[PDB]
């Protein structure tokens, strides 16, 4: 039924959003949140340090 179709099914779900969205914004947004995300583990890194 709406089981059976696995991943099949959520490419056509997938693209509703896409419509909507756009394939040229779900990568533009990792990318953006990359920058900050990759700042973050920097400052953790200096949590977990607490040391030179």
């Known amino acids: ?9 959520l490419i056509l779900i997938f693209v509703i959003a896409l419509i ?20 973050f583990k920097s400052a953790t890194k200096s949590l977990v340090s607490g040391d030179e």
């Open 1 to 9: 039924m709406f089981s059976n179709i696995g991943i099949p099914g």
């Open 20 to 39: 909507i969205f756009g394939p040229s914004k779900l990568p533009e947004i990792g990318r953006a949140a990359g920058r900050t995300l990759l700042e």
